[PDB]
């Protein structure tokens, strides 16, 4: 064809080695390229590219500010002309404008948080929408405006809740041994799956949960990790604060049973809560407690701990092998995102020109996507609001700081099993026999 002069239209300028680079192997994959040439292929006239659009929109603020993005796509939209110009308005002016509008579609639809944060950004968007013309254009863009006005505001019945020493309603009696182990693992899996689902890629992209404004940008992620940390700490605290060896063997056993049910529900965050508790300094050393622990449950806990070993080779294998719903362990995702960003260049230099490294951003987007796949399917399980609120309001650390508390735990480990073994009196008046992890009927 034939395009404007690259002096009233920056995108008109053509591909070159100083402009775009691709991969190997359909529609060709961008290795890297100037931001101009990225907005170009993002609204290319020869083909639509919904995949590249989703990916670009997920991962762009690490090289383009949202305001710059709007300015660039508007500059792309307003095209100069070079009567045989029918080919142009037919094979350029019209599909290019399609793609530009259809990128505003996606940006406004899935990524509306850019406009809630910057109000004048939304104002520029609404202006640009309201300057589109052509009787067909108006009817197409009408729906794009609908979206903006919108955002500006089973098989069988799930199994019966299980009860133990504590009866429904008696919240005062709730505790690790008086609730039913199955229902404990159930309701914790409900909390942990919700906490998981709620994590939004805007919090993971940019390694943004590791930086000084992490409390602002990644509140869902931090709330989930603090749940997991809290649960491991409550487990440790239940163990070492049970000074009687008989009662403490009951406690460690019930916790391994909870671990089994976590394994069944494919709640891997839940599995690693208990695994990390068992690995902690205060608990690891209680040889007298693990002595009286039956070998069935020792193989349970061994198989669970196996998963973490060799950089989780086995957890990754099992997470592959099984079928949703599940709760993955999030820290591996966090490390892979961080190391992909910090471990690959922001830019590639060709011919003394700087080219945004895009396949790094694509590698990020793949991991966020793999996260969001496990967020779709939910759990066939009845919510028990009271057990749930019990585990929400757990605070094993009290008013103590981290070190003060981990020290208290270790010092209790030495109190209860020194480096003779003393004898401590019983603390639980109710019986200590697990009803087991096989359900009722």
């Amino acid at each position: 064809m034939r395009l404007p002069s690259a002096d009233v239209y920056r995108f008109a300028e053509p591909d070159s080695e100083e402009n775009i680079i691709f991969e190997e192997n359909g529609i060709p994959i961008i290795k890297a390229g100037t931001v101009i040439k990225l907005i170009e292929r993002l609204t290319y006239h020869m083909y639509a590219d919904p995949n590249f659009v989703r990916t670009f929109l997920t991962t762009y603020r690490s090289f383009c500010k949202p305001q710059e993005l709007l300015s660039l796509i508007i500059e792309r939209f307003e095209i100069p002309e070079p009567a045989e110009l029918k080919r142009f308005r037919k094979e350029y002016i019209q599909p290019v404008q399609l793609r530009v509008l259809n990128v505003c579609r996606h940006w406004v639809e899935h990524h509306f948080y850019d406009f809630e944060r910057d109000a004048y950004l939304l104002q520029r968007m609404e202006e640009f929408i309201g300057t589109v013309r052509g009787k067909a254009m108006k009817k197409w863009v009408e729906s794009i405006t609908k979206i903006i006005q919108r955002k500006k505001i089973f098989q069988s019945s799930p199994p019966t809740v299980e009860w133990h020493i504590s009866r429904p309603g008696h919240i005062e009696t709730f505790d690790l041994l008086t609730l039913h182990p199955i229902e404990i693992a159930r309701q914790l899996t409900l909390l942990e799956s919700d906490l998981y689902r709620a994590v939004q890629p805007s919090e993971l992209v940019g390694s943004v949960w590791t930086k000084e404004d992490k409390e602002i940008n990644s509140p869902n992620l931090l709330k989930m990790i603090r749940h997991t940390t809290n649960l491991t700490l409550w487990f440790e605290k239940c163990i070492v604060e049970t000074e009687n060896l008989e009662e403490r063997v009951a406690v460690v056993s019930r916790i391994i049973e909870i671990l089994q049910v976590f394994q069944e529900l494919n709640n891997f965050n839940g599995v690693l809560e208990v695994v990390s508790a068992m690995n902690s300094s205060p608990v690891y050393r209680l040889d007298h407690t693990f002595e009286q622990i039956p070998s069935r449950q020792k193989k349970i806990l061994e198989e669970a701990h196996e998963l973490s070993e060799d950089h989780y080779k086995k957890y990754l294998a099992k997470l592959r092998s099984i079928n949703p719903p599940c709760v993955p362990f999030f820290g591996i995702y966090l490390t892979n995102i961080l190391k992909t960003e910090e471990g690959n260049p922001e830019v590639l230099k060709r011919h003394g020109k700087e080219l945004i490294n895009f396949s790094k951003r694509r590698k990020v987007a793949e991991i966020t996507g793999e996260i969001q796949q496990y967020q779709n399917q939910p759990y066939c399980l009845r919510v028990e609001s009271d057990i749930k609120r019990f585990f929400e309001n757990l605070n094993p650390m009290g008013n103590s700081m981290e070190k003060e508390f981990t020290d208290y735990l270790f010092n209790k480990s030495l109190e209860i099993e020194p480096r003779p073994l003393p004898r401590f009196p019983k603390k639980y008046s109710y019986p200590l026999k697990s009803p087991g992890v096989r359900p009722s009927n």
Binding site: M278, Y284, L286, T289, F290, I293, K298, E302, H305
Partner: peptide, 9 residues
């Protein structure tokens, strides 16, 4: 020997 929960010895 291994972990407090590893296979017997």
């Amino acid at each position: 020997k291994x972990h407090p929960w590893s296979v017997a010895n």
